[PDB]
Structure formats: C-alpha cells, structure tokens
Amino acid sequence: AGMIIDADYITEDGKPIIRIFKKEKGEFKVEYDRTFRPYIYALLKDDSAIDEVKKITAERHGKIVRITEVEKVQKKFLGRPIEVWKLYLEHPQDVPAIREKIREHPAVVDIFEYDIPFAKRYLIDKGLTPMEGNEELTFLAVDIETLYHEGEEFGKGPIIMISYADEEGAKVITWKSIDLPYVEVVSSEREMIKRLVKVIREKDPDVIITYNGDNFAFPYLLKRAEKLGIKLPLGRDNSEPKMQRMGDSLAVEIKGRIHFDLFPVIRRTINLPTYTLEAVYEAIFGKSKEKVYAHEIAEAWETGKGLERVAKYSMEDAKVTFELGKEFFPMEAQLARLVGQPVWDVSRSSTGNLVEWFLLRKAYERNELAPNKPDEREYERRLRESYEKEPEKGLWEGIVSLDFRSLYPSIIITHNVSPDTLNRENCKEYDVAPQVGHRFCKDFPGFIPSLLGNLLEERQKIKKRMKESKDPVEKKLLDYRQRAIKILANSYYGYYGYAKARWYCKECAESVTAWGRQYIDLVRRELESRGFKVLYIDTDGLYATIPGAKHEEIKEKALKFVEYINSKLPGLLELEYEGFYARGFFVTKKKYALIDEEGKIVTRGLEIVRRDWSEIAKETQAKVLEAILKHGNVDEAVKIVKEVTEKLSKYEIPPEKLVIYEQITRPLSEYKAIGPHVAVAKRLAAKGVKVKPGMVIGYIVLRGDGPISKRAIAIEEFDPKKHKYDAEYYIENQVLPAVERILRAFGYRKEDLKY
DNA sequence: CGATCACG
DNA sequence: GGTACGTGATCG
Ligand SMILES: [Mn+2]
Ligand SMILES: [Mn+2]
Incomplete structure (x- = not known):
C-alpha cells in the first residue's frame, strides 16, 4: 500500500465506482471499489414506522429511486445512546433526490449525515488517510499570459504565452519569434495549447501548481480550447480539467493529479495588503520580482517590440510559482493527512472546515452521530446571537506582540467544554464558567x-x-x-x-472566553507591574511597550517576561512572543497598523487595495499610512488629505485616478439592484457591446442630481472637455472613508480632514 | 431602513 | 456532486 493523493467516484451502468488515486514506489496506481454504498440515517418515532419509511420513493435521471436496504443501528448523539436507521441507496445522487421525502414523513423525527460527499464518506468510513508515508511526489508549475484590452469579455483575447517550471528549469511556449534559450516558438495559439498538453502528459506531474489557476489560467485555457475546437486531456484518465463552483468563484480539478492553487493557500497563511505574485515572493523569500503590466504585454505583442521582456516575466512567474509551491505544499500535505481529506480540498478550506472534517472522521471512529449543519433560519440566528478592551490612542514606538491562542485548547480540556457536556440533566459534578455561569458536566470527557x-x-x-x-x-x-x-x-x-458548524456551541465559546480572560488579566497585571503599557488586547493576543524605553531593553524584558509567565502557568498553557515593531497605532478590534524594524508595514482591517476603490483613495491612504508609520507624522497625514480633497474640488486630479472597476457576474436582466457598474453596462449592451459575466466595468462618477448610478459614465466615453467628475463623491465616498478610520486613532473626525 | 452586490 | 466568508457600499 502506497500514498493516497485523492479519491472520487465514476458511474458505470448507473452504479458508482470509487476511485482511489495512489503513488506507490514512484508509480501511479488507481484502485477501484464497487462495494461501498451510500446512506443516510433516520431517527423514527417508533420501530414500527420503518415498514412505511423503507417504501419511500423518488425520481432521478428518468428512473425511480428506492431505499436499497435498511439497518437498525445503536449510536451516540449529544453524549447519549440513540437508535437510528441506516437507509442505504444505490447511487450517491439518490441522497439529494430522496432526503426531503424521508424528512417530510410524519414518523421521521430527523435525518442525519445527508450532505457528506460520497468520496469523503468513503475515506472516513474505510479509515483511509491521504498523504501517509515518505512517497516523493513530482511537481510542475504552469502559468499563462493573455492579450488583454480594456473591459473585454473573458476569453476574447488569445493566450500569447504558456510557461511551466520544475527542477529541470523554467520554460515558455509562444507563437511569435523571441530569441531566448528558454523560449519554444510554435506556429499558433492552437499549437501552443497542444504543446502544454504534451508537456503535462510527458512530465506526468503528480502536482500541478498555479497562482490563481482556479479562476484565471484553467478557465481561460478551457475557454480558448473551446473556441479552437481542441481538447485538454490533462487528467490521468484523459479527462479535461473540471470547473467546480466554490462560492461565486471557481475551483479546478485535474483527475489523478493534485491541482495545487497557491492563491487560497497564501491568502490564509500570510498577511498582505495585496496578493500579487511579486508581493508574495518578496514576503516569503525576501527577493524582489519585476511586474510587467497587461497594457505593456499588449503593446509588446501588437508592436512585436520588447517581447524578450514579456517572455522573461512569463518565465519568472512559472519559476517563482514552482518555488512557492515547494515552500507551501509540505504543510498542506500534513494538514491533509491530519484531517484525513485530500490536499485539493484541504488547501481550499478554512480552519473551521478543517475542524469539521477532523470531527466527522472522529465521529465515525467513536460511533457518534454527527449533528446537522444549520438551516438558513438557524445560521442567521447564530450570526445575531450576542456574547456575554478599547485600544490606546496615538502613535506608539517599540511595540512588542504577544500571542494568547495556545491557551484555549488547554482551557477546553481542563474544563471539559463541549456541546455534549453543557447543562446536562442528573449530572453529579460540574464546572461553572465565571460570569456567564454555564455548567459543564465532569461525569464523562x-x-x-x-x-x-x-x-x-x-x-x-x-x-x-x-x-x-x-x-x-x-x-x-x-x-x-x-x-x-x-x-x-x-x-x-x-x-x-x-455559525455554519455542526458542533457549534455559543455557550462553549463564551465559557472558554470567560476562563481564558483570567489568564489574560494575569498577563496584563504582570506586564503592568514590570513597567509595560498594554496598548491593545484581543482574545488572540496583545501589544505592549515600555513608554520611553530603548528597543533592545523592551525586547530583552519581553523575552524574559514570556520565559517567566510560562514557568508560572500550569500544563500546556503557553504565551508566545510573536514579534517586535518600530511603530504602531490601533483603531478598534482587529483594526490596526504597525511597521517593523526592516520598514515593512503590517495592517489589519484598514487597507483598501482593491479594484472597486479609485486610485486617488488608495494612493491617499498609502500616503497617510506612510506619513504615520515611516515619518511618525500624523500632522503630515492630515495635510496630505486636506491637499488631496482641495485638488479634487478644483479639478486638479487626473481622471485616470478616478476610475472604479466592478465585475458583471450575471446576465444584465438578472439584476435586482442596478448599481453604477450595471447602469454603465446596460448602456454598453444597448450600443451593441456583448456584455457577459466576467466583464469588468471601468467607470467615473459625474457631477449631477440623483443617485450615483444615473451619473456614472464608462471610462472609454469620458471626455475631460465635455464631462465634469463629482468632486463631492470622490471626497466623501472615496478619499475620506479610506482615511477617516485611520485618523480617528489620533482624534480627528471626517470634518477635520478638509479646509 | 432591509436587501442586494462585489472584493479578494 | 455541493456549489465560501466577512465586510462595506449602494439600491430600492
Ligand atoms: Mn474531488
Ligand atoms: Mn502571469
């Protein structure tokens, strides 16, 4: 038995066959299982009811669906014995066809484990864990460059370069003559796409690494392959990459391989205002990377001048994508193994969903019936439920960061905090949470x-x-x-x-907060007696300084302080020295900004580096943060805002810095609320423009009466002679909101930021 | 206001 | 194979 890398199912003669993809002593192996059956559980009012319940029917694929076999089983639910009926089905697609028919029934109290994908059901029930062993996987980074012009439909422009990289080196496939050692010149876009297919089939990588390949590279390759009438047999079974709907965005799977998209991974792992490949590479490897913008790529391709620069950029994108994949995959591989689900799914999950998958496997192992996910009503009510400090103002120097998170698992264990132990009837001994008063039964773990x-x-x-x-x-x-x-x-x-958790427990979370706080108050008091000033405290950690002290002294005392507290705190309760910052300011909970000794600015819940904010607002915000953190000057920052707003009033700001970008996500007739980008889009469609989901609309808000939608103009239609932008909109809805939260940490109101 | 929409 | 989340802007 080798190393499991993925699992799925295929249908044959209407019956499901589980496929387990393995790597065994350097070789790809696929194991097939036809014997595992789909099922759900039903809790009935009485055993007699099963005779009526087993006879429930549904329809799918023209044909009727039946309960194949029924089995009475004894399990644990809410820390109590329970008798439920396991309802077997022929095909996993039968479950969403029949589950509500079963739930409807007057004799059915509730149904359970009815939204567990078949391939994940298999891995859990068969006690199979992905990524076990020392088996060495092969990797290939893939990237593409496209010809793009302002506000074009997704896929209109051809793919102009395809790059790939591994330990053999970084390469580029293009269909224009470029004389570089790593460039392969082919005859057309069609032949370039066929060459990538050939490189993937010949290298046969276990892992295909991309940077946002879920939303850009693979959907674009599929769109161009469609237009060109060619297939992409990238799957080890010759299937094409498969687009999966995850939220409003996409997820692409390649069967028999791991499509490892770094974009969701890096977004979770590190904190950055922008997740450009260049910013990410510099953050991880401390090395600078050049960017070649889309407009420069278009000019070089169309002119045929400066193409060597574009091929170098394409080559580096693959090269750094390979290095980043190799850096980040080991941890994703260990998380996969720990939760017992494939890297593909795990690399695309929140920690909450990692916990749920760990709990679901452990629930099967312990014969514990899993609780259901909430309905829309229950999910919203949880978001509403209320739980039982305010930062120091001003700019602080020499900030030490302490992390509390490694405190909470120990509190959950010692106080037996669990939904199954909360307010138990006929309990002999219990733990009472401070202030909140929740009782947790001590009688069973x-x-x-x-x-x-x-x-x-x-x-x-x-x-x-x-x-x-x-x-x-x-x-x-x-x-x-x-x-x-x-x-x-x-x-x-x-x-x-x-709020979406199966083992959700509001009283559990408050109790842990109440018990945790006693240790937070201890840390705070011990810091304060040492001369430290606490500037910010969250359940996650704190920021402190020693007012008017030398930086080496603050560090030395802080490092001594953690060493001391950890020696006083029992068990596995642990304080962690996260880091040091030259300067910093705090607005509210998880809204702050700091600067380290190397000059890097680290912020939380403040920066607006997004395409739906104008350059003037983004530029002004970066300048305000630099004035505060690099120059230690809030008066400079206030003057920057006052100058920019006056310049907007006097029409001194270039219109290119006023463009807002927003994507069209549906057919225009499907919109309920017509926002400015949609009003602009409808006018374009009226003109004959093929408006499709994916199209990004660039607009400028003009002066006038009414809502902004009636006053927005497409950028290509903006004429500086004819049109006059709305200075009030750019001051009040763009520039001031971008800086007002930051400046409030220093005693300014929106009204103080103008002349 | 509550509902709807989009960013990454 | 169920088809994200938290958060702020703008509509109706
Ligand atoms: Mn899968
Ligand atoms: Mn690229």
Missing part, C-alpha cells in the same frame, strides 16, 4: 475535549521525538507535523462560534 487532549499529547510525543532524533530528514517532517497539530488545535476555540 466531552467529545471535543477528548479529541483535543489526544491532539496535544500526539504533538508532545512528536516534539520529544524531535529532541532525541539525529536524522535531519525526519526532524523536518516531524516539525511540519507538530505545526499542523498546533494549527488544528488552535482552531477549536473559533470553531465553537462558527
């Missing part, structure tokens, strides 16, 4: 505390094996493993409060 204890013990064993290991290879692997456990264990606190 709760489902979650029990799992968390095993997680923490497993991490301590790995850490002990690391000290006693003389092998640098296993030390590396074990380091990723104990880190993966820390990430999962530290996600439970937040999960209890996650």
